[PDB]
């Protein structure tokens, strides 16, 4: 890690609902990847019910 915080910031604004905790967790595991992580997150918000 060196400058993932900036990417994390993008995530905060990218998803006005996801808790910072979750953003940090997924980000860390996915080797600080935005394209892949976010890509999956996009579909997640398909529909509540």
């Amino acid at each position: 890690n060196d400058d993932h915080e900036s990417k994390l910031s993008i995530l905060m604004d990218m998803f006005p609902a996801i808790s910072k905790s979750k953003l940090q967790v997924h980000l860390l595991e996915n080797n600080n990847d935005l394209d892949l992580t976010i890509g999956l997150l996009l579909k997640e918000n398909d529909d509540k019910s």
């Binding site: 990847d33 935005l34 394209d35 976010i38």
Partner: protein
């Protein structure tokens, strides 16, 4: 009316669009300015990429909305 287009990297672009326009139109204009393929660029908003050819009314997009754009090429 105009909506902001913030990039994953760090760059926002203002694009004029009618309330009853279409997301697809936005993608086209953005492509014209930067010159990035629509397929590559991901127009994310409200925690999800906006569907091409959809009126703002559906998503209820306000004015000067900060739409995020993530390039598919390279990155992860």
């Amino acid at each position: 009316m105009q909506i902001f287009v913030k990039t994953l990297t760090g760059k926002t672009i203002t694009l004029e669009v009618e309330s009853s326009d279409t997301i697809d139109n936005v993608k086209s204009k953005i492509q014209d300015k930067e010159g990035i393929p629509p397929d590559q660029q991901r127009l994310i908003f409200a925690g999800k990429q906006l569907e091409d050819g959809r009126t703002l009314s559906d998503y209820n997009i306000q004015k000067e909305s900060t739409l995020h754009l993530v390039l598919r090429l390279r990155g992860g």
